[PDB]
Design a protein around this ligand. Structure first.
Ligand code: A1A3Y
Length: 93
């Protein structure tokens, strides 16, 4: 059975006005700004943006990839698909 989300988990994350986007639950670096209560730091592959989301917008990658893991015209999306499949735990600093 599922656990809670933890850093390193791979997801498609949903933001208003955007397709479900390949992303990961990030760690918070020492000294870094912490998310709000009940939110996780989401790192979006491809665009390398960060946003803070709750579980309602987080779809586990393995379950969801057949639905959401297809090319998109949006900027950074296909680069994002490559990263989540090929090196999802790399430094993209
Ligand atoms: C990838 C994502 C949907 C995350 C938040 C902003 N961004 C789109 C705008 N560049």
């Amino acid at each position: 059975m599922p656990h809670a989300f933890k850093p390193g988990d791979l997801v498609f994350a949903k933001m208003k006005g955007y397709p479900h986007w390949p992303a990961r639950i990030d760690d918070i670096a020492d000294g870094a700004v912490k998310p709000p209560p009940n939110k996780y730091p989401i790192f979006f592959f491809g665009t390398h943006e960060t946003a803070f989301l709750g579980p309602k917008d987080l779809f586990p990658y393995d379950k969801s990839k057949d639905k959401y893991g297809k090319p998109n015209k949006r900027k950074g999306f296909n680069e994002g698909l490559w990263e989540i499949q090929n090196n999802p735990h790399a430094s993209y600093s």
